[PDB]
């Protein structure tokens, strides 16, 4: 995250850190005790699928304080329409091997109904994006979890204000075009979380952009509302052998 602040410990309790062989991979969002939503592109270069770990309750990466909970990722589910190396359909549903324990520091973000998300949440101007990604374009990643408030643009206005992949109906833009404030590499897969009448909801996934905080460009986010029914159906399904699963979309 570029131009944000530290998320005070316990104030981003749905935030997930994904690790591969102990190394930082991506962020993700907890949506109940065994399910995490992330970005499909996070897994384009995984070689050993059995070394993916999800960490909940994480805040400061330089210390252990006992609120952290690690879990093996048993399944990575990606829609059939996603093509590795590309931007569209950038979503993954991750099944943890064992539930996390909900605590003051570990709490799921609500996955909203589609209509509610489309008719109501989509018009809430500002939302929060978070992660341990780069603090600057071409710079070091964060040791403490950062968060940033960003405004959402209608796609017509994003295209008009920007100055290369399309912005499809499975995406939306959010942030600033003055180079001050953005999500960045390493924040990929993390939450874009929207507040409505006292509760927070998952509306986007940190997905892509032209560099980070590039003047004349906005951050791009996977439009989660398009995937609600797809997600809900997979969460009611029985696990299958083999970590990676491609599932038909729609």
């Amino acid at each position: 995250i570029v131009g944000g602040k530290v998320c005070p410990k316990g104030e981003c309790p749905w935030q997930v850190l994904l690790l591969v062989n102990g190394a930082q991979l991506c962020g993700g969002t907890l949506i109940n005790t065994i399910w995490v939503v992330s970005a499909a592109h996070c897994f384009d270069k995984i070689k050993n699928w059995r070394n993916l770990i999800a960490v909940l309750g994480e805040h400061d990466l330089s210390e252990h304080d006992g609120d952290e909970q690690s879990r093996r990722v048993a399944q990575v589910i990606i829609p059939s329409t996603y093509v590795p190396g590309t931007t569209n359909h950038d979503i993954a549903l991750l099944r943890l091997h064992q539930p996390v324990v909900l605590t003051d520091h570990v709490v799921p973000l609500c996955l909203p109904e589609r209509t509610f998300s489309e008719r109501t949440l989509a018009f809430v101007r500002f939302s929060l994006v978070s992660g341990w990604g780069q603090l600057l374009d071409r710079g070091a990643t964060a040791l403490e979890l950062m968060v940033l408030n960003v405004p959402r643009l209608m796609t017509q206005d994003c295209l008009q204000q920007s100055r290369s992949p399309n912005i499809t109906e499975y995406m939306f833009c959010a942030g600033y075009s003055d180079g001050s404030k953005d999500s960045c590499k390493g924040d990929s897969g993390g939450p874009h979380a929207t507040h409505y009448r006292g509760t927070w909801y998952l509306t986007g996934i940190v997905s892509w952009g032209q560099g980070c905080a590039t003047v004349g460009h906005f951050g791009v986010y996977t439009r989660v509302s398009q995937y609600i029914e797809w997600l809900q159906k997979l969460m009611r399904s029985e696990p299958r052998p083999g970590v990676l699963l491609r599932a038909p979309f729609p």
Binding site: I31, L102, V107, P108, E113, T199, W200
Partner: protein, 58 residues
């Protein structure tokens, strides 16, 4: 009332029904109050709420 305007007055989710009928619903871990619109937590850790802040104003 209709769900496309002002969320049907619902705090959370809204269904339109045949006629001038609307039903509000709440996410798992919440229940709908007798006002027909508000949602109250039924568990310690409902989704989308931040315990340290909820306690900070309890």
């Amino acid at each position: 009332l209709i769900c496309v305007n002002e969320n049907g007055g619902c705090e959370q989710y809204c269904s339109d029904h045949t006629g001038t009928k609307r039903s509000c619903r709440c996410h798992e871990g919440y229940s709908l109050l007798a006002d027909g619109v508000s949602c109250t937590p039924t568990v310690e850790y409902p989704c989308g709420k931040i315990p340290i802040l909820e306690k900070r104003n309890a």
